[PDB]
Structure formats: C-alpha cells, structure tokens
Amino acid sequence: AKQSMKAREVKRVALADKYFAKRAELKAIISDVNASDEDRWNAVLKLQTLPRDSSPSRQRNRCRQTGRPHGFLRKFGLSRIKVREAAMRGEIPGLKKASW
Amino acid sequence: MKKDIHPKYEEITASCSCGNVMKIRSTVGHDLNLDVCSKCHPFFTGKQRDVATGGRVDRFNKRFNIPGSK
C-alpha cells in the first residue's frame, strides 16, 4: 500500500503499546469488568479522547513486508500473495504442498 | 306484537341477575382507567450507573488474578 499507509501503521502500534498497555486497566477497573458495584467513577469517560488513535482495535495487521491491506496470515506474519513466493523457494521451513 | 313474529323472549327474560363471575356485570370494564405513557425512560430513572441481572456474589477489588498458573 502507499508509504503513508505503512507509516500510519507504525505510529498506531507504537502508541498502542505506550498508552493502551497502561490505560487498558483504567478501562478495566473503572468502566467494564470491576466497575460492578465499585461504581463507574467518571474519570475514564472524559480521559480517553487523546488516546483515540491508539486503540489496539484500530490496528489491522496487514503485512510486515509488502503492506498488503488484506489477506493477512498471522500464523506467519505475512500475507497470501507474497507468502507463497517464500514458500515456493523453501524459505518457510517445513512448508510444502498439502495432500490428504 | 303479533303472535307469529317469534321472539326467544322467555330465555332472554330468564336468568336475569348475572354475577361478576357469571357474565362480568357493568361493574367491570372501567377498571383499567386510562391509557398510560411515562416518558421518564431508564437512565432518566435516576440511574447514572448500571449493572447486570445477577452475579452479585464476591464483589471487591482484585486486579485480574483469575488465571490458574499462566
């Protein structure tokens, strides 16, 4: 994809780790799971506007070589079209044609 | 009232005091008085905080100690 789409993906994940690993449990304690009779103490609801583009949900994984935005395979870290080219040369170890 | 216009009027006259049990009376049917709407919805019901049906045992702060040896 465009070099900007590859650039967007790096900034989202670097901030996902920075903010959202920390601010996951502001979500967890205060809003969802353990808000149950511990109230919903209304800090978080205000807070989370500057985090907006750092949600772990607002990433789609999408290929750490070619940057294809679809068809990904998280089992390898690659995607359809390019994965097979590596499998063809035998650089994905143990991988070969499937017969049953 | 010629004789051959045949009413069923012995039956229609008969059995004349009917109960609330037998045939409801005119003392039943105004009872649900008026047709009611209340526009103070849930979350207008003073609920600024919400909680699910059931599961209310053991509520305290424990920060995610739920895995059995992860």
Coordinates of N, CA, C and O in Angstrom, one line a residue:
Chain A
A1 N 0.8 -1.2 0.0 CA 0.0 0.0 0.0 C 0.9 1.2 0.0 O 2.1 1.2 0.0
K2 N 0.3 2.5 0.0 CA 1.0 3.7 0.0 C 2.0 3.8 1.1 O 1.8 3.2 2.2
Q3 N 3.0 4.6 1.0 CA 4.1 4.7 2.1 C 3.5 5.3 3.3 O 3.9 5.0 4.4
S4 N 2.5 6.2 3.1 CA 1.7 6.7 4.2 C 0.9 5.6 4.9 O 0.8 5.7 6.2
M5 N 0.3 4.6 4.3 CA -0.4 3.6 5.0 C 0.6 2.7 5.8 O 0.3 2.3 6.9
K6 N 1.8 2.5 5.4 CA 2.8 1.8 6.2 C 3.3 2.7 7.3 O 3.5 2.3 8.5
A7 N 3.4 4.0 7.1 CA 3.7 5.0 8.1 C 2.6 5.1 9.2 O 2.9 5.2 10.4
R8 N 1.3 5.2 8.8 CA 0.2 5.2 9.8 C 0.2 4.0 10.7 O 0.2 4.1 11.9
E9 N 0.4 2.8 10.1 CA 0.5 1.5 10.9 C 1.6 1.5 11.9 O 1.4 1.1 13.1
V10 N 2.8 2.1 11.7 CA 3.9 2.2 12.7 C 3.5 3.2 13.8 O 3.8 2.9 15.0
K11 N 2.9 4.3 13.5 CA 2.5 5.2 14.6 C 1.4 4.7 15.4 O 1.4 4.9 16.6
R12 N 0.4 3.9 14.8 CA -0.6 3.4 15.7 C -0.1 2.3 16.7 O -0.5 2.3 17.9
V13 N 0.8 1.5 16.3 CA 1.3 0.4 17.2 C 2.2 0.9 18.2 O 2.2 0.4 19.3
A14 N 3.1 1.9 17.9 CA 4.0 2.4 18.9 C 3.2 3.1 20.0 O 3.7 3.2 21.1
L15 N 2.0 3.6 19.7 CA 1.2 4.3 20.7 C 0.3 3.4 21.4 O 0.0 3.6 22.5
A16 N -0.1 2.3 20.7 CA -0.9 1.3 21.3 C -0.2 0.7 22.5 O -0.7 0.6 23.6
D17 N 1.1 0.3 22.3 CA 2.0 0.0 23.4 C 2.2 1.1 24.4 O 2.2 0.8 25.6
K18 N 2.4 2.3 24.0 CA 2.7 3.4 25.0 C 1.5 3.7 25.9 O 1.6 3.6 27.1
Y19 N 0.3 4.0 25.3 CA -0.8 4.4 26.1 C -1.6 3.3 26.6 O -1.9 3.2 27.7
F20 N -1.9 2.3 25.7 CA -3.0 1.4 25.9 C -2.6 0.3 26.7 O -3.5 -0.2 27.5
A21 N -1.4 -0.2 26.7 CA -1.0 -1.1 27.7 C -1.1 -0.5 29.1 O -1.6 -1.1 30.1
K22 N -0.7 0.8 29.4 CA -1.1 1.5 30.6 C -2.6 1.7 30.8 O -3.1 1.5 31.9
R23 N -3.4 2.1 29.8 CA -4.7 2.7 30.0 C -5.8 1.7 29.8 O -6.9 2.0 30.1
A24 N -5.4 0.5 29.3 CA -6.2 -0.7 29.4 C -6.8 -0.9 30.8 O -8.0 -1.1 30.9
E25 N -6.0 -0.8 31.8 CA -6.6 -1.1 33.1 C -7.3 0.1 33.7 O -8.0 0.0 34.7
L26 N -7.2 1.3 33.1 CA -8.1 2.3 33.5 C -9.5 2.0 33.0 O -10.5 2.1 33.7
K27 N -9.6 1.5 31.7 CA -10.8 0.9 31.2 C -11.4 -0.3 32.1 O -12.5 -0.4 32.4
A28 N -10.5 -1.2 32.5 CA -10.9 -2.4 33.1 C -11.4 -2.3 34.5 O -12.4 -2.8 34.9
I29 N -10.7 -1.5 35.3 CA -11.1 -1.3 36.7 C -12.3 -0.5 36.8 O -13.3 -0.7 37.5
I30 N -12.4 0.6 36.0 CA -13.2 1.7 36.3 C -14.4 1.7 35.5 O -15.5 2.3 35.8
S31 N -14.4 1.1 34.3 CA -15.5 1.1 33.4 C -16.2 -0.3 33.3 O -17.3 -0.5 33.6
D32 N -15.4 -1.3 32.8 CA -16.0 -2.6 32.5 C -16.1 -3.5 33.7 O -16.9 -3.4 34.6
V33 N -15.2 -4.5 33.7 CA -15.3 -5.7 34.5 C -15.5 -5.5 36.0 O -16.4 -5.9 36.6
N34 N -14.6 -4.6 36.6 CA -14.6 -4.4 38.0 C -15.2 -3.1 38.4 O -15.0 -2.6 39.5
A35 N -16.0 -2.5 37.5 CA -16.9 -1.4 37.8 C -18.1 -1.9 38.6 O -18.8 -1.1 39.3
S36 N -18.4 -3.2 38.5 CA -19.5 -3.9 39.2 C -19.5 -3.7 40.7 O -18.8 -4.3 41.4
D37 N -20.4 -2.8 41.1 CA -20.5 -2.3 42.5 C -19.3 -1.6 43.1 O -19.2 -1.4 44.3
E38 N -18.4 -1.2 42.3 CA -17.2 -0.3 42.7 C -17.4 1.0 42.0 O -16.5 1.9 42.0
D39 N -18.7 1.3 41.6 CA -19.1 2.4 40.7 C -18.4 2.4 39.4 O -17.7 1.5 38.9
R40 N -18.6 3.5 38.6 CA -18.2 3.7 37.2 C -17.3 5.0 37.2 O -17.2 5.6 36.1
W41 N -16.7 5.4 38.4 CA -16.1 6.6 38.7 C -15.6 7.4 37.5 O -14.6 7.0 36.8
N42 N -16.2 8.5 37.2 CA -16.3 9.0 35.8 C -15.1 9.8 35.4 O -15.2 10.9 34.9
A43 N -13.9 9.3 35.6 CA -12.7 9.8 35.1 C -12.5 9.4 33.7 O -12.5 10.3 32.8
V44 N -12.5 8.1 33.4 CA -12.1 7.5 32.1 C -12.8 8.0 30.9 O -12.2 8.3 29.8
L45 N -14.1 8.2 31.0 CA -15.0 8.7 30.0 C -14.6 10.0 29.5 O -14.5 10.2 28.3
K46 N -14.2 11.0 30.3 CA -13.5 12.1 29.9 C -12.2 11.9 29.3 O -11.8 12.5 28.3
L47 N -11.3 11.1 29.9 CA -9.9 10.9 29.6 C -9.5 10.5 28.2 O -8.6 11.0 27.6
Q48 N -10.3 9.6 27.6 CA -9.8 8.8 26.6 C -9.9 9.4 25.2 O -9.7 8.7 24.2
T49 N -10.2 10.7 25.1 CA -10.2 11.4 23.8 C -8.8 11.5 23.2 O -8.6 11.2 22.0
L50 N -7.7 11.9 23.9 CA -6.4 12.0 23.4 C -5.8 10.6 23.0 O -5.1 10.5 22.0
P51 N -6.1 9.5 23.7 CA -5.9 8.2 23.2 C -6.5 7.7 21.9 O -6.3 6.6 21.5
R52 N -7.4 8.5 21.2 CA -8.3 7.9 20.2 C -7.8 7.1 19.1 O -8.4 6.1 18.7
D53 N -6.6 7.4 18.6 CA -5.9 6.6 17.5 C -4.9 5.6 18.0 O -4.2 5.0 17.3
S54 N -5.0 5.3 19.4 CA -4.1 4.3 20.0 C -4.8 3.1 20.5 O -4.2 2.2 21.2
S55 N -6.1 2.9 20.1 CA -6.8 1.7 20.5 C -6.2 0.4 19.8 O -6.0 0.4 18.6
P56 N -5.9 -0.7 20.5 CA -5.5 -1.9 19.9 C -6.4 -2.5 18.9 O -6.0 -3.3 18.1
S57 N -7.7 -2.0 18.9 CA -8.7 -2.4 18.0 C -8.7 -1.6 16.7 O -9.4 -1.9 15.7
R58 N -7.8 -0.6 16.6 CA -7.9 0.4 15.5 C -6.6 0.2 14.6 O -6.3 0.9 13.7
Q59 N -5.9 -0.9 14.9 CA -4.9 -1.5 14.0 C -5.5 -2.7 13.2 O -6.4 -3.4 13.7
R60 N -5.1 -2.8 12.0 CA -5.4 -4.1 11.2 C -4.0 -4.5 10.7 O -3.2 -3.6 10.3
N61 N -3.6 -5.8 10.8 CA -2.3 -6.2 11.0 C -1.4 -6.0 9.7 O -0.4 -5.3 9.8
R62 N -1.9 -6.5 8.6 CA -1.6 -6.1 7.3 C -0.2 -6.0 6.8 O 0.3 -4.9 6.2
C63 N 0.6 -7.0 7.0 CA 1.8 -7.4 6.2 C 3.0 -6.6 6.5 O 3.2 -5.5 6.1
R64 N 4.0 -7.3 7.1 CA 5.3 -6.6 7.5 C 6.3 -6.7 6.4 O 7.5 -6.4 6.7
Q65 N 5.9 -7.0 5.2 CA 6.8 -6.8 4.0 C 6.1 -5.9 3.0 O 6.3 -4.7 2.9
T66 N 5.1 -6.4 2.2 CA 4.6 -5.8 1.1 C 3.6 -4.7 1.4 O 3.3 -3.8 0.6
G67 N 3.0 -4.7 2.6 CA 2.0 -3.8 3.0 C 0.7 -4.0 2.3 O -0.1 -3.0 2.1
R68 N 0.3 -5.2 2.0 CA -1.0 -5.5 1.5 C -2.0 -5.3 2.6 O -1.8 -5.7 3.7
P69 N -3.2 -4.7 2.4 CA -4.0 -4.3 3.5 C -5.1 -5.3 3.7 O -6.1 -5.0 4.4
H70 N -5.0 -6.5 3.2 CA -6.0 -7.5 3.2 C -5.3 -8.9 3.1 O -4.1 -9.0 2.7
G71 N -5.9 -10.0 3.5 CA -5.4 -11.3 3.2 C -4.3 -11.8 4.1 O -3.6 -12.8 3.8
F72 N -4.1 -11.1 5.2 CA -3.0 -11.4 6.1 C -3.1 -12.8 6.8 O -4.2 -13.4 6.8
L73 N -2.0 -13.3 7.3 CA -1.9 -14.6 7.9 C -1.1 -14.5 9.1 O 0.2 -14.4 9.0
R74 N -1.7 -14.4 10.3 CA -1.0 -14.0 11.5 C -0.1 -15.1 12.0 O 0.9 -14.9 12.7
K75 N -0.4 -16.3 11.6 CA 0.4 -17.5 11.8 C 1.8 -17.4 11.3 O 2.7 -18.0 11.8
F76 N 2.0 -16.6 10.2 CA 3.3 -16.4 9.6 C 3.8 -15.0 9.8 O 5.0 -14.8 9.9
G77 N 2.9 -14.0 9.8 CA 3.3 -12.6 9.8 C 3.5 -12.2 8.3 O 4.3 -11.3 8.1
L78 N 2.8 -12.8 7.4 CA 2.9 -12.4 6.0 C 1.6 -12.4 5.4 O 0.6 -12.6 6.1
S79 N 1.4 -12.3 4.1 CA 0.1 -12.3 3.5 C 0.1 -13.2 2.3 O 1.1 -13.5 1.8
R80 N -1.1 -13.6 1.8 CA -1.4 -14.5 0.7 C -0.4 -14.5 -0.4 O 0.4 -15.4 -0.6
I81 N -0.4 -13.4 -1.2 CA 0.3 -13.3 -2.4 C 1.9 -13.4 -2.2 O 2.5 -14.2 -2.9
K82 N 2.4 -12.7 -1.3 CA 3.9 -12.8 -1.0 C 4.3 -14.0 -0.2 O 5.4 -14.5 -0.4
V83 N 3.5 -14.6 0.6 CA 3.7 -15.8 1.5 C 4.1 -17.0 0.6 O 5.1 -17.7 0.8
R84 N 3.3 -17.2 -0.4 CA 3.5 -18.3 -1.3 C 4.9 -18.1 -2.0 O 5.5 -19.1 -2.2
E85 N 5.3 -16.9 -2.4 CA 6.6 -16.8 -3.0 C 7.7 -17.2 -2.1 O 8.7 -17.9 -2.6
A86 N 7.6 -17.0 -0.8 CA 8.6 -17.5 0.1 C 8.5 -19.0 0.3 O 9.5 -19.7 0.3
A87 N 7.3 -19.6 0.3 CA 7.1 -21.0 0.4 C 7.6 -21.7 -0.9 O 8.2 -22.8 -0.7
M88 N 7.4 -21.2 -2.1 CA 8.0 -21.6 -3.3 C 9.5 -21.8 -3.3 O 10.0 -22.7 -3.9
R89 N 10.2 -20.9 -2.6 CA 11.7 -21.0 -2.6 C 12.2 -21.9 -1.5 O 13.3 -22.3 -1.4
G90 N 11.3 -22.2 -0.5 CA 11.6 -23.0 0.6 C 12.3 -22.3 1.7 O 13.1 -22.8 2.4
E91 N 11.9 -21.1 2.0 CA 12.4 -20.3 3.0 C 11.5 -20.2 4.2 O 11.8 -19.7 5.2
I92 N 10.3 -20.8 4.1 CA 9.4 -21.0 5.2 C 9.6 -22.5 5.6 O 9.1 -23.3 4.9
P93 N 10.3 -22.8 6.7 CA 10.8 -24.2 6.9 C 9.7 -25.1 7.1 O 8.7 -24.7 7.7
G94 N 9.8 -26.3 6.6 CA 8.8 -27.4 6.8 C 7.5 -27.2 5.9 O 6.6 -28.1 6.0
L95 N 7.4 -26.2 5.1 CA 6.2 -25.9 4.4 C 6.3 -26.5 3.0 O 7.3 -26.3 2.3
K96 N 5.3 -27.3 2.6 CA 5.2 -27.9 1.3 C 3.8 -28.1 0.9 O 2.9 -27.9 1.7
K97 N 3.5 -28.6 -0.3 CA 2.2 -28.9 -0.8 C 1.4 -29.9 0.0 O 2.0 -30.8 0.6
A98 N 0.1 -29.7 0.2 CA -0.7 -30.5 1.0 C -1.5 -31.6 0.3 O -2.3 -31.3 -0.6
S99 N -1.2 -32.8 0.6 CA -2.0 -33.9 0.1 C -2.6 -34.7 1.2 O -2.0 -34.9 2.2
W100 N -3.9 -35.0 1.1 CA -4.7 -35.8 2.0 C -5.4 -36.9 1.2 O -6.4 -37.5 1.6
Chain B
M1 N -97.0 -6.6 18.3 CA -96.7 -7.9 18.9 C -97.8 -8.8 18.4 O -98.7 -9.2 19.1
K2 N -97.7 -9.2 17.1 CA -98.5 -10.3 16.6 C -97.9 -11.6 17.1 O -96.8 -11.6 17.5
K3 N -98.6 -12.7 17.0 CA -98.2 -13.9 17.7 C -97.1 -14.7 17.0 O -96.4 -15.5 17.6
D4 N -96.8 -14.4 15.7 CA -96.0 -15.3 14.9 C -94.7 -14.7 14.5 O -94.0 -15.1 13.6
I5 N -94.3 -13.6 15.2 CA -93.0 -12.9 15.0 C -91.9 -13.5 15.8 O -90.8 -13.0 15.8
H6 N -92.2 -14.6 16.5 CA -91.2 -15.4 17.3 C -90.0 -14.8 17.9 O -88.9 -15.0 17.4
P7 N -90.1 -14.0 18.9 CA -89.1 -13.8 19.9 C -88.6 -15.0 20.6 O -89.4 -16.0 20.7
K8 N -87.5 -15.0 21.3 CA -87.0 -16.0 22.2 C -87.1 -15.5 23.6 O -86.3 -15.8 24.5
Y9 N -88.2 -14.8 23.9 CA -88.2 -13.8 25.0 C -88.3 -14.5 26.4 O -87.9 -13.9 27.4
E10 N -88.8 -15.7 26.5 CA -88.7 -16.4 27.7 C -87.3 -16.6 28.2 O -87.0 -16.4 29.4
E11 N -86.4 -17.0 27.3 CA -84.9 -17.2 27.6 C -84.2 -15.9 27.8 O -83.4 -15.7 28.7
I12 N -84.5 -14.9 27.0 CA -84.0 -13.5 27.1 C -84.4 -12.8 28.4 O -83.5 -12.3 29.1
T13 N -85.7 -12.9 28.8 CA -86.1 -12.5 30.1 C -85.4 -13.3 31.3 O -84.9 -12.7 32.2
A14 N -85.4 -14.7 31.2 CA -84.8 -15.6 32.2 C -83.3 -15.4 32.6 O -82.5 -14.8 31.8
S15 N -83.0 -15.8 33.8 CA -81.6 -15.9 34.3 C -81.0 -14.5 34.5 O -79.9 -14.2 34.0
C16 N -81.7 -13.6 35.2 CA -81.6 -12.2 35.0 C -80.7 -11.4 35.9 O -80.4 -10.2 35.7
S17 N -80.0 -12.0 36.9 CA -79.3 -11.2 37.9 C -77.8 -11.3 37.7 O -77.0 -10.8 38.6
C18 N -77.3 -11.9 36.6 CA -75.9 -12.4 36.4 C -74.8 -11.8 37.2 O -74.6 -10.6 37.2
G19 N -74.0 -12.6 37.9 CA -72.8 -12.2 38.6 C -71.7 -11.7 37.8 O -71.6 -11.8 36.6
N20 N -70.8 -11.1 38.6 CA -69.4 -10.7 38.2 C -68.6 -11.9 37.7 O -67.9 -11.9 36.7
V21 N -68.8 -13.1 38.4 CA -68.3 -14.3 37.9 C -69.1 -14.9 36.7 O -68.5 -15.3 35.8
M22 N -70.4 -14.8 36.7 CA -71.2 -15.4 35.6 C -71.1 -14.8 34.3 O -70.8 -15.4 33.3
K23 N -71.2 -13.4 34.2 CA -71.2 -12.7 33.0 C -70.7 -11.2 33.2 O -71.2 -10.3 32.7
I24 N -69.7 -11.0 34.1 CA -68.9 -9.8 34.4 C -69.5 -8.6 34.9 O -68.9 -7.8 35.6
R25 N -70.8 -8.4 34.7 CA -71.6 -7.1 35.0 C -71.1 -5.9 34.3 O -70.0 -5.8 33.6
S26 N -71.8 -4.8 34.6 CA -71.4 -3.4 34.1 C -70.7 -2.8 35.3 O -70.4 -1.6 35.2
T27 N -70.3 -3.5 36.3 CA -69.4 -3.1 37.3 C -68.0 -3.5 37.1 O -67.1 -3.2 37.9
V28 N -67.7 -4.1 35.9 CA -66.4 -4.4 35.4 C -66.2 -3.9 34.0 O -67.0 -4.1 33.1
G29 N -65.1 -3.2 33.7 CA -64.6 -2.7 32.4 C -64.2 -1.3 32.4 O -63.8 -0.8 31.3
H30 N -64.3 -0.5 33.5 CA -63.7 0.8 33.5 C -62.4 0.8 34.4 O -61.8 1.8 34.6
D31 N -62.1 -0.4 34.9 CA -61.2 -0.7 35.9 C -59.8 -0.3 35.6 O -59.1 0.3 36.4
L32 N -59.2 -0.6 34.4 CA -58.0 0.0 33.9 C -58.4 1.3 33.2 O -58.8 1.4 32.1
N33 N -58.2 2.4 34.0 CA -58.9 3.6 33.9 C -58.5 4.4 32.7 O -59.3 5.1 32.0
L34 N -57.2 4.4 32.4 CA -56.6 5.4 31.5 C -55.4 4.8 30.8 O -54.8 3.8 31.3
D35 N -55.0 5.3 29.7 CA -54.1 4.8 28.7 C -52.7 5.5 29.0 O -52.6 6.7 28.6
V36 N -51.8 4.8 29.6 CA -50.7 5.5 30.3 C -49.3 5.4 29.6 O -48.8 4.3 29.2
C37 N -48.6 6.5 29.4 CA -47.3 6.6 28.9 C -46.5 7.4 29.9 O -47.0 8.4 30.4
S38 N -45.3 6.9 30.2 CA -44.3 7.6 31.1 C -43.0 7.8 30.3 O -42.4 6.8 29.9
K39 N -42.6 9.0 30.1 CA -41.5 9.4 29.2 C -40.2 9.6 29.9 O -39.2 10.0 29.3
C40 N -40.2 9.4 31.2 CA -39.0 9.4 32.0 C -38.3 8.0 32.0 O -38.3 7.2 32.9
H41 N -37.8 7.7 30.8 CA -37.1 6.4 30.4 C -36.1 5.9 31.4 O -35.6 6.7 32.3
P42 N -35.7 4.6 31.5 CA -34.5 4.2 32.1 C -33.3 5.1 31.7 O -33.2 5.6 30.6
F43 N -32.4 5.5 32.7 CA -31.4 6.5 32.6 C -31.9 7.9 32.8 O -31.2 8.9 32.9
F44 N -33.2 8.0 32.8 CA -33.9 9.2 33.4 C -34.4 8.7 34.8 O -34.8 9.6 35.6
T45 N -34.4 7.4 35.1 CA -34.9 6.8 36.3 C -33.9 6.9 37.5 O -33.9 6.1 38.4
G46 N -33.1 8.0 37.4 CA -32.1 8.2 38.4 C -30.9 7.4 38.3 O -29.9 7.5 39.1
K47 N -30.8 6.5 37.3 CA -29.7 5.6 37.1 C -28.7 6.3 36.2 O -28.7 6.4 35.0
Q48 N -27.6 6.8 36.9 CA -26.5 7.3 36.3 C -25.3 6.3 36.3 O -24.3 6.4 35.7
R49 N -25.6 5.1 37.0 CA -24.8 4.0 37.0 C -25.6 2.7 36.7 O -26.8 2.7 37.1
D50 N -25.1 1.7 36.0 CA -25.8 0.5 35.6 C -25.0 -0.8 35.9 O -23.8 -0.8 36.1
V51 N -25.7 -1.9 36.0 CA -25.3 -3.2 36.5 C -26.2 -4.3 35.9 O -27.4 -4.0 35.6
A52 N -25.7 -5.5 35.7 CA -26.4 -6.6 35.0 C -27.3 -7.4 35.9 O -27.3 -7.2 37.1
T53 N -28.2 -8.2 35.3 CA -29.0 -9.2 36.0 C -28.1 -10.3 36.7 O -27.4 -11.0 36.0
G54 N -28.1 -10.4 38.0 CA -27.3 -11.4 38.7 C -25.8 -11.2 38.7 O -25.2 -10.3 38.2
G55 N -25.2 -12.2 39.4 CA -23.7 -12.3 39.5 C -23.1 -11.5 40.6 O -22.0 -11.0 40.6
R56 N -23.9 -11.2 41.7 CA -23.6 -10.2 42.7 C -22.8 -10.6 43.9 O -22.4 -9.8 44.7
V57 N -22.5 -11.9 44.0 CA -21.6 -12.5 44.9 C -20.2 -12.1 44.7 O -19.7 -11.9 43.6
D58 N -19.4 -12.0 45.9 CA -17.9 -11.7 45.9 C -17.5 -10.5 45.1 O -16.6 -10.5 44.3
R59 N -18.0 -9.3 45.5 CA -17.6 -8.0 44.8 C -16.7 -7.2 45.7 O -17.0 -6.8 46.9
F60 N -15.4 -7.0 45.2 CA -14.3 -6.4 45.9 C -13.3 -6.0 44.7 O -13.5 -6.4 43.6
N61 N -12.2 -5.3 45.1 CA -11.2 -5.0 44.1 C -10.1 -6.1 44.1 O -9.3 -6.2 45.0
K62 N -10.1 -7.0 43.1 CA -8.9 -7.8 42.8 C -8.6 -7.6 41.3 O -9.4 -7.8 40.4
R63 N -7.3 -7.2 41.1 CA -6.8 -6.8 39.7 C -6.4 -8.1 38.9 O -5.2 -8.4 38.9
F64 N -7.3 -8.8 38.3 CA -7.1 -9.8 37.3 C -6.2 -11.0 37.8 O -5.3 -11.4 37.1
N65 N -6.6 -11.6 38.9 CA -5.8 -12.7 39.5 C -6.5 -14.0 39.0 O -6.3 -15.1 39.6
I66 N -7.4 -14.0 38.0 CA -8.2 -15.1 37.5 C -7.5 -16.2 36.8 O -8.2 -17.3 36.7
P67 N -6.3 -16.2 36.1 CA -5.7 -17.4 35.5 C -5.2 -18.4 36.6 O -4.6 -18.0 37.5
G68 N -5.4 -19.7 36.3 CA -4.7 -20.8 37.1 C -3.4 -21.2 36.6 O -3.2 -22.2 35.9
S69 N -2.3 -20.4 37.0 CA -0.9 -20.6 36.6 C -0.7 -20.3 35.1 O -0.4 -21.2 34.3
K70 N -0.7 -19.0 34.8 CA -0.3 -18.5 33.5 C 1.2 -17.9 33.6 O 2.1 -18.6 33.0

